Structures are given as structure tokens and as C-alpha cells.
Amino acid sequence: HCRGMAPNGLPNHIMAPVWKCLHLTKDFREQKHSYWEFAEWIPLAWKWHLLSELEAAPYLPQEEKSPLFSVQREGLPEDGTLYRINRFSSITAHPERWDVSFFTGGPLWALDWCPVPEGAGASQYVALFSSPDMNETHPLSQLHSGPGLLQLWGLGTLQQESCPGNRAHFVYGIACDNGCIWDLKFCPSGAWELPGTPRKAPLLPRLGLLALACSDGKVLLFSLPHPEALLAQQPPDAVKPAIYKVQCVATLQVGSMQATDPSECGQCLSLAWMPTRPHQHLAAGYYNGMVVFWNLPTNSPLQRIRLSDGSLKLYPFQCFLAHDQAVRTLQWCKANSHFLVSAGSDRKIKFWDLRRPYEPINSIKRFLSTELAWLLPYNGVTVAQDNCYASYGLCGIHYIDAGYLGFKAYFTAPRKGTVWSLSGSDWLGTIAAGDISGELIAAILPDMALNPINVKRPVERRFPIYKADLIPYRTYTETVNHHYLLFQDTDLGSFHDLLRREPMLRMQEGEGHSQLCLDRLQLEAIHKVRFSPNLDSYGWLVSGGQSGLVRIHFVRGLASPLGHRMQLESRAHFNAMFQ
Amino acid sequence: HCRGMAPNGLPNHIMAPVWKCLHLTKDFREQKHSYWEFAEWIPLAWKWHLLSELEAAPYLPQEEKSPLFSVQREGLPEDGTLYRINRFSSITAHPERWDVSFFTGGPLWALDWCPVPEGAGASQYVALFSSPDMNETHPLSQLHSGPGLLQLWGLGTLQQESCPGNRAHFVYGIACDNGCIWDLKFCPSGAWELPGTPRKAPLLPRLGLLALACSDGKVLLFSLPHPEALLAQQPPDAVKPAIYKVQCVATLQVGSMQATDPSECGQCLSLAWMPTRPHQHLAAGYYNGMVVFWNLPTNSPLQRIRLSDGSLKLYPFQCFLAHDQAVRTLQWCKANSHFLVSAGSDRKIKFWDLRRPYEPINSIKRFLSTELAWLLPYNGVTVAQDNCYASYGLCGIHYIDAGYLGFKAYFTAPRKGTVWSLSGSDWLGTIAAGDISGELIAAILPDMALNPINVKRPVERRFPIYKADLIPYRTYTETVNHHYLLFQDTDLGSFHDLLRREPMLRMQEGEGHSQLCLDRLQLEAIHKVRFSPNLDSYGWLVSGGQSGLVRIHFVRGLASPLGHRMQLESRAHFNAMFQ
């Protein structure tokens, strides 16, 4: 037991699970991540054909300039100006709070951080996809296969010595000829190597491995080069946007050798890498309700064949019909990779045992669900939710035990709108969520080893990061000609007097009372949210949505002595090992 | 300097030499080993006549069953069952700690790993000799010439997936007429080829080249076939403990054409292969104190002649009287093969320059020296010692600079008993040592380019791998009838709490306090130790001695991210080279 106030102004019993999560994650990654995997799949610079503007012009997301926006920061003077920034361009970080906003030219629909290995102190990058058009929308049952652009954005190193005056740099983009990308998952560890690694001139040092869940119904696997390694090969007369057309390492698809009929699987809707070394398997959820596994190292002539360009086509080794409808989500269990969870548009969650796929461990019928988080330390899964079937006022975010403990679902955050995304930081045991109301919240989970019904009130464990509002000033032009975005950002510096601070009141006046908006584009809506997976920057969070603006925030109040020590202790071992 | 603790629980400054040694060895082997040598000396199956069990029995070691023993492991509740296993029987690997034990039928007196090319991932073997009798002992002055058996033991492949449930398999042995064997060395590189190599029916894919220091005063040079090719040639009805009468590739002896007088050199006592490409020279130490060199490719009719069976006889090209008494050890410099070091029963370590053999580079007088190790990165030599002349309590293991740096001898490990054998791992930068006291000790050397007196307490840099004891429930039978061997192993997985864990507190009574046994067989004495020279399995170690039991260990705490990184990069390159 513990009592009194933590240095950040939360009670110690609210912080104590967070500190426990650091040790469990540090211990886990030492055991079950690795520093190198897939040595065979390093980049080749001659496969990265830089496009001219004439060739690139079809792929660029079509809005050249952001909506007008403004930022108010809690406790600071009111800015009163309106900002508006070009596509592929960024405002500068606020000098004290280091929040950044950058514009991707289209509404964001996938987002993930590159996993830099532990304490390596590297430059930090987010990959993202923003749809070509702000108001185009895609029916699930149809394969789209249009043109679209994967974007990689560099954020600097995000050390305190770097964050004041930081900017997001669009380092390069990959032209994808495979339509919308619905999910991005980097290989969790073992894909990255040092940017100055000595390699023969074509073999650019590898930044990571990125899997793309395409609306074409297939998964593309790219190994990424470091940006400066490209420019060292690239001619210096290049276009300012560094747009590339790129060959896959592999295209993953569902089928068989000589399969005559293209599969009914439809769109690929979700991904998960195997969370443990050697990360050899990838799972994807399809529209037909299947979950499909490709064995990436597979030598076998039955799964692997090489296309005339040299990319691999991989067919799966295992499929099971997990759901009666689209498999909108997957999470793979970190603590034991024989277990998996999936949630589908049939509004069942199903936990799975991959050795015995004929029945789930536990099906729990629920409201329609949009994303799952399965944090390492906890037996259950947290669900983001669509309100369309909820009891009114009881929609929101729910933590659901996998069933052995049998606690009732912990109602961590009531929301009136739908929640489009979750991310759980293993370093924090926090969960953050993006809402169509344009509000971003974070919550600290109670220690789910102990019955959550003993929690006196969940409201003490959550705080808003920001809310977007529209200020007047059913399509994008009918909106942006008549409104600007206001971002209201909280003082994340500490949580003293939290329940009386005005933004925390403002959020509570949104809960239970706020109304769905249906007479405009819902430009405020936040689609994806991601805590940093990296121990360096572990307290950084990135989010964006229907505005196509992407914002980076630092949740300074969860920067803590144990984290800072663990960063430096890990820093020393890295520099003692890799130099 | 670097501060903090590595995740294995050793300080980073203690481990930083161990990590550095991987890079230095890799750069050396890229430049100075080779993929194929002695292309003419491919094994021919018709030279391998399989003995029946009736023919083999005179060559078989006379003990059909091991001494009784038990094995104990730090942190596992004690087993205490008394094992007793037949000649050529292996116990099964411990499912998690992967230690393996098997009985050779006699006391172990020679041992080396088969050198597997970097990245090959091959089956991993030890070739060994074990004396015909547990209690018989041979006078140095005499050419014993009694028959005995060279043994080849396959250890499986030591891949992570293969280590649980592994066993050591006696794949075959060679019936040797030329006396007992005092030393075994493989051709350090370029002998191995793929077991799947297509070759004509008389040829067999070559496992290695092996040279024997016979007590008959001559050196036997064998090319080993891969076992599968023998078993494909062998009739399947034959006895699977296959014992072959093998014709030598070459027989190496001191003399000249028409030299009627048999050489006074007596027994051969130590070998060194030329450590660098093309490995053309083999050096041997002799009882009369000479060091003798054969140029194995030699065409010259003055050095090479072919016997009627087609085996070679080679006379040397150069000799010198290095010592006043038997040359107990040779070590040949890897960094520059002009230099060689030797030790002898006259208890001087002499560093030689083989261009100028009349005067050693340096002669340092010491205690009676039993084996030397010369790790690639370090200028000096580490000496194992008999205690019979030592200043009391100062016996044990010393590292001795070749003299330019001029440091005092680094007293790396005090021992009461005589260290019978020593082995460095160039990959690890660490050394291990077998004692009549029955401990196996391993120790980490500092960066010997810097003054070792800066090491304030070397006890922080060593650990006991195991101790062998006799438990009472002058000859072998009168011993085993009243005692059994207890092997107690440390938890090699990490070095946390090391200086508090009971094996160190026990070992600190082995140092200094331990009263040496002299009144029985010394049945616990460890006569040989060998780290693996192979990048695959580089953290594995083999040991054995008067018990006739081999035991194998994996020093899990020293295998590291750089080891895994390096293994995979070498695996990718090797797979790109051989297909």
C-alpha cells in the first residue's frame, strides 16, 4: 500500500501501477525483443526510383494547404492569430511545451512510430498515410486499388536538448499503387540498425520493416532506408518533396500456388506482428472474417515464389474463420504469443489460442468495436467503441478481463461520441483515445491484478490532452471556407488540482452531455493516436484525423525519475555496446 | 571509461573488452582465414575400413561404464539420483540449461572443436582421445606406441531450437596404432565443406583436417569425412559405434631421406597450426626440447615421400632446440605468424621470431608451465602452472606481457591446485581453466593494452562454472566403490548477486584455503578445456578429465546482442555464398 502525493501531483496509488509498468516492460524487452532480425532484407538503393514532379503529381494528397487553425495553451496568453501551413510542412515546436503540428495534405488514416532500439537515442520517425481526398470515402466490400502515398515524417531525436525549436521534416514518401492503407505496423524490434553502419554503397542502412494493410486486399512489406543514405545515392538535383516509387521486399497475399480464383477475403483491415523474437509471423484481419498468418522467413516452394522484379510473393500457412463479419482489429499477446485477440464488426470480441483455433478461449459479446489495446502487464483487453448500439450514456472505453479473474468491465472513460483509436504505452500503462468530438484523452489504468470495483472513481485517473473545436468564421470546402480549428491544449506539466482545473471541467462537461455532430464534415474528428513505443521519447504521443493535421504532444507529467534513470542506464549500455 | 551495469549484471567496463573482442576477431577472420584449402586432400571412402566389434575391442577404452555421478544446478532443487552410463552413452541435455554429459570410456587426454566456417550453422563436433586405462600412466622418456582410439563426438548443432533434448552422438572413431595421443589440432580454417556437397562416389564431403601428437613421436594428419557420407557408404547392418582403421593422409616425422638413425626427439607433446592462410605450416614440440616445422604442401623430393599405400611421409624443413627440456606447449601468434611462443619443463616461456630462431624475442622464467593461451587482441600470453615450484598461494593463472608494455604479470586467478589446461575464446575475450581441485574457472581479461594494476580486485572478473567433488556415499575401482562424483553448476544466465551467490563463496574457499588432495586418484581432475572457436556456438564450452565424463556448458551470460547480430550477418553472407 502507498499514500500521499506523487511528485507530479497524482496520488501515489494512481502512479504506483505506472512505475510497475516500466520495470515489467524493461524486463520483457530484454528477454523477448532482439537487436537484429531479417538480415537478408536490407534495402537496395537501385530499387528506389525517385520520381519527378510530373510523375509524383498523381500521388500527392490533393489539399495543398491545411484548414485554418489556432492553439490556446492552458495558463498562457491567448495567441489570437490563425495559423495555416503548407502540405509537407510544419510549424515550429512551442518553446516550453514542445507540441508540434504538421500537415499531411489529407485525412489521416494510419500512423505508427518506428521502433528505435532501447536507449539508442536515434532520430524518431512516424510513418503515416493520409487519404488522397478529404471527402472521398470507401465502401468496405469493394477492393479500391487506387493510387496513394505513404509518408514518412522525421521528428528529430526528441531529447530535451532538441525539442525547443524542433520541427517535423517530411523525409520521403513512397508512392503506393495499392489504394488506401488501413493499418501500419513496424516490426517491433530487430529491424533497425545504426545510421552510420558501414555497408556497400547499394545496401543502405535499414531504418525498419513496415507492413501495409492495403485496401487492395494484400499486405506490402517494405524495409526502409535511413533518409541520408538515400540522399548519398540520390542525385543532388532532386525535387523538394522526395517522393519515391519503391519495390516491395515482399507482397503478402492470400491464395495458393496455381490458385485459379482470387480469394473472397476482400480488403485487408488490420495487422499484428508476432510480439516476440524472432517476430517471424504476421497476422492480418480480412473483410471476409478470416485472420491470416504469413511465415515471413519461409523457404518452402509452397509459400514463397519470386516475381520477375525480385520481390517475394508469400501465401499464408494458416487461416481460420475468426469472425462472422469484418475483422476490424487484432492484438497479439505480448506475454505469450500463442494467444491472440480479435474484435470484429459482428461486435464480439474473441480471444484465441493459436494452437487450437477451432474455438476461442472466450467470446464476449459487446457493442460495436473499433480498436483494441492489450497492454503487456494485464490479462485483459481495452476496447475502443462505437456508440451506435450502446445504452445511452454508457458508451465509452471499457477494459475487459480475459475472464479468469472475472471482474466486471472497468468503465475507464464514458464518451458520447465514438472513439476511433486507442494506444497503450507499455512504458506507462496509460491509454489514450481519439474521439469524433475532437477531444483527446489519456487515462491511467488501475492495477488489473486487483479488482477494479474497488476503484472509488475513474475520473481521478484520466485527463484531457486537448480538444479541437470548430469556430464559425457537408463537405470540406463548405467547412474550411466558414470555420477554423481551435486546439485547446492542457498544461501537461503537472496534475496538481486536476479535478478543478478548467480543461478537466470542460472535458467532464463533454462527458454525458456532448452531442453528435451531423450537419458538417466532422473536421474535428481524431482518427489515430499512438504513444511512442520507444524508451527514449516514451512520454511522447502523436495524433491526427479528419483535419489532416497531425499533432505531437509530450505528456510531461508522466516523465518520472524511474523513467529518466532507466533511459540513462540503458543509454550507457548501448554506448558501451554499439559505437 | 563507461559506467553502469550491463543487463547481464556485469559492469559495462568489465564487459566492454568482451564486446570489443568480437569485432577484432571478425576483422581478422575476414582477412586471414579462408574458405577452401588443401583441395587435393578430400577423403576417399576406400581408405576407411570399418572394423567389426571383434576387431574393435582391443582398441576400445577398457571402461564400459562411467563412475557413478550426480548433477546439481544453482537454483534448482537438487536431483541427487545417481546416474551411471555406458561407454559412448550420453545423458540428455537439461531442457533449460542445456548442459550435456557423456562418457568416453577412459580418462580424457586430448580435445578440440571441429572448426566450422563463420555462419555455416553446421553440426558441431569435438574430436577427442581418451586413454586406454583409468590408472595406467606413461613415462615421458619412452615411445609408448600402444594402440588406442581417436574419437569423434557430434554435439548436434547447438542452435537455440536444438539445445533442449540434445544429446552427444559418438558418430565414429579411428583405431590408432601410433600410441596414445597427447594433442589434437584441426586445420584452423578452409578444411570444412558442406555435407550436401555433390562429390563422386569414392570421395566424401570433408568435415575437417586433424593432426595428432602421438606418443609414438610422430604426427598423424587425417582428413575427416562427414559422417552421413560414411553411413551412406557403410552397410546398414554394421555396428553403429563404427570404429575405422583409417589410412593417414600424411605421416609427419623428424628425419631425412636415407636417415638411418632414428631421431632422439622422443614423444611429440604439443602442436600449433599456422594460424593464418594458407595454414601451410604445422609446428610440433618434442620431448628432446626441439620445435619442428613441416611445410604440408611441400612438393620437394627432399621433404616429401609417398608410402606404398599412397599416404605421405613428410620430413621437416626447419628445426631448432628451443628448450632445455620437453616442450609442453606451443602457441602461434594469430596477428603475425612470424612469431611463436613456447613453454617447457625447464619452466621458461620463450617468445620466438621464426625468421630468427637462434635468439628468443623474450625469455621469462616462471613456474613449471602446463599450457599457454594467446588471445588475438593481446600482446602477451596467459600461463597455466603447476604449483610444485610456486611461491605458496601465488600459484594459479597469470597473464604475461611479451614485454614491450612492461607491466607486471596480471595474477588473474589464484589457485591451490595445478591447472591442467587452459583455453581462450577470441570471440569472447575470456579464458577458462581446468584444475585438479575439480573447479572449472572462467575469467574475463581487462583491456591488456592498459596497465592491469588499475584492476583493483580481479575477483570481480571471474566465476566458477562448476566444481566436481567426490562424495563418499589407491585406484579407480577402490575409489568408485566408495565415492561418487557430484557436479554442481552455477546459474550461467546472469552474474547478478555473483559475489553473494554460494558458488563464489565456495570458490573463494577453493582459492587460498583449499587443502590439496594427494592420497587418491584425483578422480575429479579436469584435464582439458576448450571454448568453441566457431562463431556459431561461440559461447559453448567443453571440458573433461580423469572422470572420463565430458561435460558441456553454455555461458549464457556472455552471449550477447553483438553475438546475435554477428551470427545473423554472417549467416546471410554464407547463405549468399553457398547454395
mmCIF file of C-alpha atoms in Angstrom, chain B residues 147-369:
data_model
loop_
_atom_site.group_PDB
_atom_site.id
_atom_site.type_symbol
_atom_site.label_atom_id
_atom_site.label_comp_id
_atom_site.label_asym_id
_atom_site.label_seq_id
_atom_site.Cartn_x
_atom_site.Cartn_y
_atom_site.Cartn_z
ATOM 1 C CA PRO B 147 47.189 -48.902 -29.552
ATOM 2 C CA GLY B 148 44.319 -46.548 -28.779
ATOM 3 C CA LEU B 149 41.199 -44.927 -30.195
ATOM 4 C CA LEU B 150 40.678 -41.449 -31.566
ATOM 5 C CA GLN B 151 37.023 -40.493 -31.079
ATOM 6 C CA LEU B 152 34.733 -38.057 -32.900
ATOM 7 C CA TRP B 153 31.664 -36.896 -30.956
ATOM 8 C CA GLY B 154 28.873 -34.968 -32.640
ATOM 9 C CA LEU B 155 27.252 -32.481 -30.266
ATOM 10 C CA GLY B 156 24.311 -31.931 -32.595
ATOM 11 C CA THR B 157 24.266 -28.354 -33.856
ATOM 12 C CA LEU B 158 23.843 -26.209 -30.696
ATOM 13 C CA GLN B 159 21.198 -23.998 -32.314
ATOM 14 C CA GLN B 160 18.755 -22.489 -29.821
ATOM 15 C CA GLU B 161 15.862 -24.652 -31.030
ATOM 16 C CA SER B 162 18.124 -27.731 -30.923
ATOM 17 C CA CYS B 163 19.596 -27.350 -27.423
ATOM 18 C CA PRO B 164 16.651 -28.773 -25.417
ATOM 19 C CA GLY B 165 16.606 -32.546 -25.734
ATOM 20 C CA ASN B 166 20.030 -32.580 -27.394
ATOM 21 C CA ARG B 167 22.472 -35.467 -26.987
ATOM 22 C CA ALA B 168 26.096 -36.136 -27.883
ATOM 23 C CA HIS B 169 26.396 -38.882 -30.504
ATOM 24 C CA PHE B 170 29.588 -40.905 -30.997
ATOM 25 C CA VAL B 171 29.444 -40.714 -34.791
ATOM 26 C CA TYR B 172 32.655 -42.720 -35.325
ATOM 27 C CA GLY B 173 36.212 -43.265 -34.154
ATOM 28 C CA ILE B 174 39.591 -44.101 -35.679
ATOM 29 C CA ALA B 175 41.678 -47.052 -34.490
ATOM 30 C CA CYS B 176 45.184 -45.642 -33.936
ATOM 31 C CA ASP B 177 48.276 -47.852 -33.708
ATOM 32 C CA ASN B 178 50.731 -44.980 -33.126
ATOM 33 C CA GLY B 179 50.433 -44.793 -29.342
ATOM 34 C CA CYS B 180 48.314 -42.566 -27.162
ATOM 35 C CA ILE B 181 47.571 -39.035 -28.370
ATOM 36 C CA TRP B 182 48.765 -36.025 -26.375
ATOM 37 C CA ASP B 183 47.354 -33.184 -28.504
ATOM 38 C CA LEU B 184 44.728 -32.622 -31.196
ATOM 39 C CA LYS B 185 44.501 -29.654 -33.555
ATOM 40 C CA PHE B 186 42.305 -29.100 -36.593
ATOM 41 C CA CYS B 187 43.360 -27.152 -39.664
ATOM 42 C CA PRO B 188 42.076 -23.820 -38.350
ATOM 43 C CA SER B 189 40.104 -22.927 -41.500
ATOM 44 C CA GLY B 190 39.326 -23.942 -45.063
ATOM 45 C CA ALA B 191 39.094 -27.682 -44.375
ATOM 46 C CA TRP B 192 35.301 -27.787 -43.989
ATOM 47 C CA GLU B 193 32.820 -28.032 -46.852
ATOM 48 C CA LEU B 194 29.062 -28.510 -46.940
ATOM 49 C CA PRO B 195 27.891 -32.042 -46.051
ATOM 50 C CA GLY B 196 25.492 -31.711 -49.004
ATOM 51 C CA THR B 197 28.362 -31.031 -51.393
ATOM 52 C CA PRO B 198 27.969 -33.136 -54.572
ATOM 53 C CA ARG B 199 31.014 -35.375 -54.950
ATOM 54 C CA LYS B 200 31.833 -38.531 -56.877
ATOM 55 C CA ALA B 201 31.148 -41.843 -55.158
ATOM 56 C CA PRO B 202 34.740 -42.515 -53.953
ATOM 57 C CA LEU B 203 35.070 -39.046 -52.434
ATOM 58 C CA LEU B 204 33.311 -37.904 -49.277
ATOM 59 C CA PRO B 205 32.444 -34.320 -48.281
ATOM 60 C CA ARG B 206 35.249 -33.272 -45.959
ATOM 61 C CA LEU B 207 34.467 -32.395 -42.354
ATOM 62 C CA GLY B 208 37.990 -31.291 -41.470
ATOM 63 C CA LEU B 209 41.711 -31.875 -41.325
ATOM 64 C CA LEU B 210 43.021 -33.152 -37.988
ATOM 65 C CA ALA B 211 46.606 -33.514 -36.751
ATOM 66 C CA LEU B 212 47.606 -35.818 -33.887
ATOM 67 C CA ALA B 213 50.516 -35.527 -31.456
ATOM 68 C CA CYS B 214 51.278 -39.220 -30.983
ATOM 69 C CA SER B 215 53.259 -40.610 -28.072
ATOM 70 C CA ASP B 216 54.993 -42.622 -30.820
ATOM 71 C CA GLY B 217 56.942 -39.443 -31.611
ATOM 72 C CA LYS B 218 55.313 -38.728 -34.979
ATOM 73 C CA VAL B 219 52.360 -36.649 -36.161
ATOM 74 C CA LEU B 220 49.388 -38.164 -37.998
ATOM 75 C CA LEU B 221 47.367 -35.942 -40.333
ATOM 76 C CA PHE B 222 43.825 -37.090 -41.153
ATOM 77 C CA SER B 223 41.057 -35.689 -43.328
ATOM 78 C CA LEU B 224 37.697 -36.354 -41.675
ATOM 79 C CA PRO B 225 34.677 -37.202 -43.840
ATOM 80 C CA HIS B 226 31.242 -36.056 -42.836
ATOM 81 C CA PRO B 227 29.536 -38.968 -41.018
ATOM 82 C CA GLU B 228 26.495 -39.098 -43.324
ATOM 83 C CA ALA B 229 28.718 -39.932 -46.297
ATOM 84 C CA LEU B 230 30.329 -42.790 -44.364
ATOM 85 C CA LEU B 231 26.923 -44.105 -43.267
ATOM 86 C CA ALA B 232 25.740 -43.917 -46.877
ATOM 87 C CA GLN B 233 28.789 -45.982 -47.850
ATOM 88 C CA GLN B 234 28.566 -48.277 -44.821
ATOM 89 C CA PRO B 235 26.322 -51.362 -44.967
ATOM 90 C CA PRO B 236 23.376 -50.618 -42.654
ATOM 91 C CA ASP B 237 23.803 -53.933 -40.787
ATOM 92 C CA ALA B 238 27.139 -52.767 -39.348
ATOM 93 C CA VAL B 239 27.688 -51.729 -35.729
ATOM 94 C CA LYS B 240 26.785 -48.045 -35.329
ATOM 95 C CA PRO B 241 29.601 -47.287 -32.853
ATOM 96 C CA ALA B 242 31.685 -47.527 -36.016
ATOM 97 C CA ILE B 243 35.434 -47.959 -35.439
ATOM 98 C CA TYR B 244 37.547 -47.438 -38.563
ATOM 99 C CA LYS B 245 41.092 -48.384 -39.441
ATOM 100 C CA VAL B 246 41.957 -45.212 -41.373
ATOM 101 C CA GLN B 247 44.916 -44.699 -43.681
ATOM 102 C CA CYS B 248 46.725 -41.461 -42.878
ATOM 103 C CA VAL B 249 46.738 -38.592 -45.324
ATOM 104 C CA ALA B 250 50.311 -37.847 -44.248
ATOM 105 C CA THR B 251 52.654 -39.101 -41.539
ATOM 106 C CA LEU B 252 54.967 -36.396 -40.204
ATOM 107 C CA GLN B 253 58.224 -37.422 -38.556
ATOM 108 C CA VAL B 254 61.657 -35.994 -37.776
ATOM 109 C CA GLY B 255 64.350 -37.263 -40.111
ATOM 110 C CA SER B 256 65.743 -37.106 -43.626
ATOM 111 C CA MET B 257 65.819 -39.170 -46.777
ATOM 112 C CA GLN B 258 68.101 -42.140 -46.029
ATOM 113 C CA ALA B 259 68.362 -41.022 -42.381
ATOM 114 C CA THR B 260 69.151 -44.448 -40.925
ATOM 115 C CA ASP B 261 69.430 -43.235 -37.314
ATOM 116 C CA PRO B 262 66.009 -42.852 -35.632
ATOM 117 C CA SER B 263 65.674 -39.366 -34.186
ATOM 118 C CA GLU B 264 66.285 -38.775 -30.463
ATOM 119 C CA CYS B 265 63.271 -36.424 -30.321
ATOM 120 C CA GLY B 266 61.089 -38.866 -28.380
ATOM 121 C CA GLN B 267 57.399 -38.181 -27.833
ATOM 122 C CA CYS B 268 55.580 -35.362 -29.587
ATOM 123 C CA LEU B 269 53.880 -33.233 -26.951
ATOM 124 C CA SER B 270 52.198 -30.157 -28.476
ATOM 125 C CA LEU B 271 51.031 -28.860 -31.853
ATOM 126 C CA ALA B 272 50.331 -25.497 -33.410
ATOM 127 C CA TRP B 273 48.904 -24.925 -36.865
ATOM 128 C CA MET B 274 49.946 -21.785 -38.704
ATOM 129 C CA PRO B 275 47.053 -19.533 -37.631
ATOM 130 C CA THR B 276 46.799 -17.676 -40.956
ATOM 131 C CA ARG B 277 46.013 -18.523 -44.584
ATOM 132 C CA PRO B 278 47.023 -20.846 -46.240
ATOM 133 C CA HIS B 279 47.852 -22.754 -42.971
ATOM 134 C CA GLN B 280 50.765 -24.322 -44.858
ATOM 135 C CA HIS B 281 52.984 -24.946 -41.790
ATOM 136 C CA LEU B 282 52.456 -27.250 -38.807
ATOM 137 C CA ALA B 283 54.761 -26.967 -35.781
ATOM 138 C CA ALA B 284 55.277 -29.572 -33.053
ATOM 139 C CA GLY B 285 57.096 -29.623 -29.731
ATOM 140 C CA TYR B 286 59.160 -32.660 -28.790
ATOM 141 C CA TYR B 287 60.470 -34.279 -25.607
ATOM 142 C CA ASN B 288 64.065 -33.542 -26.505
ATOM 143 C CA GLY B 289 63.159 -29.815 -26.402
ATOM 144 C CA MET B 290 63.085 -29.193 -30.143
ATOM 145 C CA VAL B 291 60.376 -27.397 -32.079
ATOM 146 C CA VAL B 292 59.838 -28.873 -35.538
ATOM 147 C CA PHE B 293 58.023 -27.452 -38.576
ATOM 148 C CA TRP B 294 56.545 -29.258 -41.577
ATOM 149 C CA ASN B 295 55.549 -27.478 -44.790
ATOM 150 C CA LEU B 296 52.491 -29.544 -45.642
ATOM 151 C CA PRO B 297 52.140 -28.610 -49.370
ATOM 152 C CA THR B 298 55.819 -29.438 -49.946
ATOM 153 C CA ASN B 299 56.465 -30.961 -53.368
ATOM 154 C CA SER B 300 60.196 -31.283 -52.731
ATOM 155 C CA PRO B 301 61.602 -34.839 -53.063
ATOM 156 C CA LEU B 302 63.885 -33.902 -50.142
ATOM 157 C CA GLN B 303 60.983 -33.447 -47.691
ATOM 158 C CA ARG B 304 58.048 -35.457 -49.092
ATOM 159 C CA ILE B 305 57.928 -39.138 -49.979
ATOM 160 C CA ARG B 306 54.858 -41.301 -50.595
ATOM 161 C CA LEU B 307 54.414 -44.709 -48.982
ATOM 162 C CA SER B 308 53.317 -47.747 -50.980
ATOM 163 C CA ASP B 309 49.741 -47.332 -49.725
ATOM 164 C CA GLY B 310 49.774 -43.761 -51.080
ATOM 165 C CA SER B 311 49.956 -41.982 -47.732
ATOM 166 C CA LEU B 312 52.613 -39.298 -47.418
ATOM 167 C CA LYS B 313 55.660 -39.264 -45.192
ATOM 168 C CA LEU B 314 56.893 -35.720 -44.532
ATOM 169 C CA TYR B 315 60.262 -34.720 -43.077
ATOM 170 C CA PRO B 316 60.584 -31.203 -41.618
ATOM 171 C CA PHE B 317 62.079 -28.173 -43.312
ATOM 172 C CA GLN B 318 63.242 -26.439 -40.114
ATOM 173 C CA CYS B 319 64.010 -27.365 -36.508
ATOM 174 C CA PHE B 320 65.589 -25.593 -33.567
ATOM 175 C CA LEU B 321 66.435 -26.599 -29.991
ATOM 176 C CA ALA B 322 64.018 -24.200 -28.328
ATOM 177 C CA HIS B 323 64.191 -25.660 -24.816
ATOM 178 C CA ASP B 324 66.500 -27.492 -22.431
ATOM 179 C CA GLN B 325 63.667 -29.978 -21.758
ATOM 180 C CA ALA B 326 60.373 -31.209 -23.216
ATOM 181 C CA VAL B 327 58.312 -28.520 -24.966
ATOM 182 C CA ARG B 328 54.999 -28.758 -23.105
ATOM 183 C CA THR B 329 53.183 -26.172 -25.238
ATOM 184 C CA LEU B 330 53.257 -24.265 -28.498
ATOM 185 C CA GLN B 331 51.108 -21.251 -29.260
ATOM 186 C CA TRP B 332 51.416 -19.494 -32.613
ATOM 187 C CA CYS B 333 50.680 -15.786 -32.991
ATOM 188 C CA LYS B 334 47.492 -15.084 -34.930
ATOM 189 C CA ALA B 335 48.147 -11.375 -35.526
ATOM 190 C CA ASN B 336 51.512 -12.104 -37.177
ATOM 191 C CA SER B 337 52.563 -15.686 -37.913
ATOM 192 C CA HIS B 338 56.289 -14.906 -37.810
ATOM 193 C CA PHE B 339 56.080 -15.128 -34.003
ATOM 194 C CA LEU B 340 55.557 -18.200 -31.820
ATOM 195 C CA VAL B 341 55.609 -18.810 -28.076
ATOM 196 C CA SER B 342 56.509 -21.986 -26.206
ATOM 197 C CA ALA B 343 56.805 -23.306 -22.672
ATOM 198 C CA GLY B 344 58.661 -26.303 -21.334
ATOM 199 C CA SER B 345 59.616 -28.408 -18.350
ATOM 200 C CA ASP B 346 62.569 -26.048 -17.890
ATOM 201 C CA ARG B 347 59.801 -23.583 -16.872
ATOM 202 C CA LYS B 348 60.817 -20.735 -19.173
ATOM 203 C CA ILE B 349 58.279 -19.145 -21.504
ATOM 204 C CA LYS B 350 60.202 -18.255 -24.668
ATOM 205 C CA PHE B 351 58.767 -15.917 -27.301
ATOM 206 C CA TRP B 352 60.253 -16.716 -30.702
ATOM 207 C CA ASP B 353 60.634 -14.981 -34.052
ATOM 208 C CA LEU B 354 60.613 -17.790 -36.600
ATOM 209 C CA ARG B 355 62.656 -15.712 -39.051
ATOM 210 C CA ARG B 356 65.469 -15.569 -36.466
ATOM 211 C CA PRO B 357 65.315 -18.791 -34.443
ATOM 212 C CA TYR B 358 68.702 -18.503 -32.692
ATOM 213 C CA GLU B 359 67.506 -15.987 -30.078
ATOM 214 C CA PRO B 360 64.067 -15.575 -28.490
ATOM 215 C CA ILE B 361 62.373 -12.185 -28.556
ATOM 216 C CA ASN B 362 61.943 -12.590 -24.798
ATOM 217 C CA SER B 363 62.516 -15.311 -22.206
ATOM 218 C CA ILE B 364 60.667 -15.022 -18.894
ATOM 219 C CA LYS B 365 61.367 -17.559 -16.152
ATOM 220 C CA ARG B 366 58.301 -18.838 -14.333
ATOM 221 C CA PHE B 367 56.811 -21.830 -12.550
ATOM 222 C CA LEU B 368 56.507 -25.142 -14.381
ATOM 223 C CA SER B 369 54.079 -24.279 -17.165
#
